[PDB]
A paper describes a structure:
Seneca virus A (SVA) is an emerging novel picornavirus that has recently been identified as the causative agent of many cases of porcine vesicular diseases in multiple countries. The full-length SVA genome is approximately 7.3 kb in length and contains a single open reading frame (ORF) encoding a single polyprotein that undergoes proteolytic processing and cleavage by the viral 3C protease (3Cpro) into four structural proteins (VP4-VP2-VP3-VP1) and eight non-structural proteins (L-2A-2B-2C-3A-3B-3C-3D). SVA 3Cpro is composed of two topologically equivalent antiparallel six-stranded β-barrel domains (A1-F1 and A2-F2). Three closely positioned residues (His48, Asp84 and Cys160) within the proteolytic active site of SVA 3Cpro comprise the canonical catalytic triad.
In this work, we first report the crystal structure of wild-type SVA 3Cpro, which indicates that SVA 3Cpro adopts a chymotrypsin-like fold and possesses the Cys-His-Asp catalytic triad conserved in most serine proteases. Judging from the electron density of Cys160, the sulfhydryl group appears to have an alternate conformation (with an angle of ~120°orientation). During the refinement of the SVA 3Cpro structure, we observed a portion of extra electron density located in the cleft mainly composed of E1’-F1 loop and α3. The region is composed of dominantly positive residues, including His75, His78, His79, Arg147, Lys198 and His202, which neighbor the proteolytic site. Considering the rough shape of this the non-protein electron density and the complementary charges, we considered this as a phospholipid-like ligand. Based on the lipid-binding assay and lipidomics data, the CL 74:6 molecule (with a molecular composition of C83H150O17P2) was assigned to the identified electron density in SVA 3Cpro. The CL molecule, especially its two phosphate groups, was well defined in the electron density map after refinement. Interestingly, the C-terminus containing the natural autocatalytic processing site (GEPLATMQG) from Molecule II, inserts into the proteolytic active site of Molecule I. Therefore, despite a crystallography artefact formed by the two contacting molecules, the SVA 3Cpro-substrate complex likely captures the physiological peptide cleavage process of SVA 3Cpro. In our SVA 3Cpro–substrate complex structure, the main chain carbonyl carbon of the substrate Gln211 was 3.1 and 3.7 Å from each γ-sulfur atom (Sγ) in two alternative sulfhydryl groups of the Cys160 nucleophile. These distances imply that it would be difficult for Cys160 to covalently bind to Gln211 through a thioester linkage.
Numbering used by the authors: 4 to 211
Write the structure that this text describes.
């Protein structure tokens, strides 16, 4: 059970983010995934909730009326729970692109490892149950997910999902939902990330 990769994910990728609201005594804390430069990945249902007035990430406070550049991923016309957010100028994130994406799909009942900063830092684990085209949720249908056998809790959203295929372990999801001891995470592809970063203007050298 080598977790050198997952520890690297915990060290460089997963961070706490807290949404501050004028509706409730405390901020809603979850996880975010630093991608590169000034962009990170976040759950759509958290980002789009109209209540928050600021959020904190990597020691910075950002208000809602700031001009974020964002990409909301869809699949065959159905929304996914995945959002990409680029902040204004500031201290750069690590370049974590090498940690995302698998070219082969994980073998059924291989091990999924979640990497979370939602309650302090922790890992969770469960076996891969396969991809699903959609889930039916309390906030509607969401597209392009995969499921894993493990009981998950409110706040674990945004945790990185590390799967294995072809001898390699990579992040291919972030946690979205739970239902009766089975969690669901929204799928992340390297090609989607690359094209979203280009749309957002996140400067990257292209390997020729
Ligand atoms: C074993 C054999 C394998 C099997 C084969 C598999 C399949 C075979 C074929 C099958 C049938 C064919 C069918 C196709 C399947 C193919 C396989 C496949 O999967 O292909 C997929 C293609 O995607 C991929 O490439 C993945 C990648 C996967 C594969 C792709 C194919 C390959 C392609 C290329 C191949 C190789 C190339 C390799 C390259 C190497 C790398 C490249 C290096 C270079 C198909 O998926 P689809 O086409 O369906 O979607 C496209 C994309 O995924 C998402 O779209 P996106 O652009 O990113 O979204 C646009 C927009 C962004 O948001 C905003 O910007 C507005 C927000 C704007 C606000 C902010 C922006 C403005 C800024 C403000 C201020 C900014 C300040 C500065 C500004 C300056 C500039 C500003 C910006 C420019 O989002 C919205 O929509 C609005 C969002 C709303 C839509 C949602 C609806 C409801 C929303 C809410 C949730 C629910 C709540 C309900 C309330 C309503």
């Amino acid at each position: 059970v080598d977790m050198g990769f997952e520890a690297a994910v915990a060290k460089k990728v997963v961070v706490p983010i807290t949404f501050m609201v004028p509706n409730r005594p405390s901020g809603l804390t979850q996880s975010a995934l630093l991608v590169t430069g000034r962009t990170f990945l976040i759950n759509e249902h958290t980002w789009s909730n109209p209540s928050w007035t600021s959020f904190t990430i990597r020691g910075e406070v950002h208000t809602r009326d700031e001009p974020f550049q964002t990409v909301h991923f869809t699949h065959h016309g159905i929304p996914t729970d995945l959002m990409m957010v680029r902040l204004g100028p500031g201290n750069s994130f690590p370049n974590n692109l090498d940690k995302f994406g698998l070219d082969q799909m994980p073998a059924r009942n291989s091990r999924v490892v979640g990497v979370s900063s939602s309650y302090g830092n922790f890992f969770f684990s469960g076996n891969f149950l396969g991809f699903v085209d959609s889930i039916t949720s309390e906030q509607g249908t969401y597209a392009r997910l995969f499921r894993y056998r493990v009981t998950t809790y409110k706040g674990w959203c945004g945790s990185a999902l590390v799967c294995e295929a072809g001898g390699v372990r990579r992040i291919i999801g972030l946690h979205s939902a739970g239902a009766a001891g089975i969690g669901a995470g929204t799928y992340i592809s390297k090609l989607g990330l690359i094209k979203a970063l280009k749309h957002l203007g996140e400067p990257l050298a292209t390997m020729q």
